[PDB]
Point group: D2
Chain length 256, copies 4
């Protein structure tokens, strides 16, 4: 499943990843739901080990186009995980207080502590994405942020944080179907804003911004994983597989 | 719901609640597990609605003697509830920074925001529990805190917070068995501290402190519920029942932009 | 100087206080500047003692109409006071994060810690002022806040905070001259906003809101002091006199 | 006055700076007090402008051996500067909550906001000082922190923070006289801790730790200035001179709303 890890050679091309790809799973939706339940139980036990050992900090970053599956991945992948050891930090439009300090200030505040698993629903990457696409700061400014991000993540990793960054990759036509479904569902209509159509008009600019951010910041200590996410069953299974394998690799143990 | 809700008449007596009482449920453990799964699914849907509507703030306070079931209640009652809308704030021994401000400072920091459900694993109630039990501060100091607490909760409720306070009520003998089981379990021992034995000698003083705190602070806008908690199946079912009924009473609507 | 403390009898009438009153000081501007310098030196020594002892928490609340002297009082009264023990918390327009919690959440965060002197430049009182005048919440909602405020301040005082609340009282014509001076000074024009002309149009409503707030919340543990503030020399001297006398009454001792 | 700026060539030697050096000021205490008052009035006006413009963030870092003058520099240099635009963040022994996150977490929380001047009384440098001297983490862990610090400061500077780092340099004999005076003064003995005698015993290890930290982290965007600080009058005058010159170089303008 290492075909999805972006190597730190700065040669990443987003066109090489197909949102409809399900090739790492030898089966379909029904078999993947059973495989996901097994990974989910392993995840609950690994979180239990993480919290009791109280040494490692785990940061899961989720980035995607609107309707790309950030909310759904949190809901399904972390289903049943002890609320005491899992925390979500969601990053929306910056406030005046947040904009009064550097862009990393509000993000650094939310990092996981020892024994905790934190999920960033959007993150510091927004400062090289919506910021670049909507020209909120000139290129001279946002271009310097790729190095800031690599170095901030290097500091976090060196100091004990296991970092996993997932780009949930959906196609333009899939986003269209999802935004239409969001509009037609009375229990989902609340998620839709008029500004989401303007973000959709800028699809190509966002894909370019994502490709540049991933190419610049996928490192050995903070890898990006590109997740084909047109199939939610595949997205949830693959994210759970990578997360479980990473946590198993920490070789955690209940204290003496 | 009615029987376990402490009325704001200042006449609460803890002796009237039996930790082994299971009288609100008829079918026994197996039937309660099935009833709990139905309530859990209703809670998951109510949380999604709370988050979508983004108007109400929900605060669940959990207080209990050590091994009383605070961790287990969070784990079971909120099983499957979307982590995006549920947050736990645990309050342990205050740090020097926290002690440098009033006792409510660290607590107020953690209150739920609009559309969020927050669980306080221990809370501001610790400031009328340990200092009273061990007489670390004079009565003149901690007796004033019942009013501060009623008024802080009145302000939170007036400003949009639905408050539910649960006292998970276990017996002294049940605590003993659980503390021994915690010690004998290699996956649970890490939780056990020597200070837990020191508080056990003070059992009666803690029961009195809890009774007084409940009597003084159970109000219409911030009720206390006494949960018979010697049977975890009953504790989980009853807490889920009260929480679901409360959330339903808010009559939340999905926004229609 | 006991005529300026609002007694907790709920009978306060703002019309009884003249913004041009200088009756507590007999010598005039020049003598007041010398008296202020002596109080200022006493204040510097009392702050060093407050910080060294590290037990008391001191909260100074400043409220006034725009151009009423909040910034000038901080600048002059605290001139020379060690920055290590004096902190200003200014409360402006609430952000989305602040509005997502009760109105006291952002305020409680800023309270002084042990050994610290905090000045609130605007405060929790804004939630019974601009809120009441501009009908940002219905009457039922803001009317309940007078009790919340009395009780929040009671808790702070019971738990070790010395509270002083100053209403810097200026006349409508004095505000007009000051806003005009702000506009005509190239080094002050930055402070002026178009919204300040709207707050000026609601003068009478704000005076009624101030009178009601002071009447409802001036208590023994958290007194309001009405400061005639048309003359800055008098305003600075009187606020310094009240503050120094209060701090002296704490009988602070250097630790041994 | 450029003689005190540590060039970013990684060749800094602490032995080349004498704590008793007063060569940038052509006079003594009395003349320096008058020169300091003129700089102090200029600083008060520059702060009012920094606050009005509301764009630049200013971070002043103070590091020194115990009794080296951190408290006194804040008190004198910022005397009369409007409290609305000046804030001190002091960094002492980390708590369990602070130790549960990376060492930069508690520091980043306190950075200056737009229009604000913040003084760090001790700072993130403690994590390559007391940590290195007392072996609180292995050489393997704290040696990586020189890069983390250079990069954290690069991010702050790129995003609008003007950074000034001052090492207030006192001699070992001067520290002895000051610690004795601290003990003998009833209004200052509250500052005296027994643990300060242990840090004093390790004087040489701390001087080596300071030399290495300054050599590794003095950059063009975040310079270190070595301040001869045995004479308080000289220390206060020189820090004020460097700070004022830096703020004047920003050429801040009062906004003119339309």
């Amino acid at each position: 499943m290492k075909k999805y890890r972006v190597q730190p050679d700065g040669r990443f091309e987003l066109k090489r990843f197909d949102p409809d790809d399900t090739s790492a799973f030898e089966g379909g939706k029904q078999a993947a739901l059973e495989a996901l339940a097994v990974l989910n139980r392993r995840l609950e036990k690994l979180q239990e080990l993480l919290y009791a050992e109280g040494q490692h900090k785990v940061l899961v970053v989720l980035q995607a186009m609107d309707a790309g599956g950030k909310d759904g991945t949190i809901r399904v992948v972390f289903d049943g995980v002890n609320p005491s050891g899992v925390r979500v930090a969601s990053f929306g439009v910056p406030t005046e207080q947040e904009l009064a300090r550097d862009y990393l200030w509000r993000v650094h505040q939310q990092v996981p502590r020892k024994g905790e698993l934190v999920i960033f629903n959007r993150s510091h990457y927004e400062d090289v994405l919506v910021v670049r696409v909507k020209n909120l700061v000139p290129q001279q400014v946002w271009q310097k942020r790729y190095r800031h991000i690599r170095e901030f993540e290097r500091m976090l990793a060196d100091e004990g944080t296991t970092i996993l960054k997932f780009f949930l990759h959906i196609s333009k036509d899939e986003q269209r179907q999802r935004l239409q479904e969001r509009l037609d569902n009375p229990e989902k209509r609340w998620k839709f804003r008029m500004g989401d159509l303007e973000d959709r008009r800028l699809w190509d600019r966002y894909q370019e911004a994502y490709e540049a951010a991933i190419r610049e910041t996928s490192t050995e200590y903070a890898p990006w994983y590109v997740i084909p996410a047109n199939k939610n069953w595949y997205r949830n299974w693959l994210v759970s597989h990578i997360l479980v394998e990473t946590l198993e690799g920490l070789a955690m143990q209940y204290p003496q």
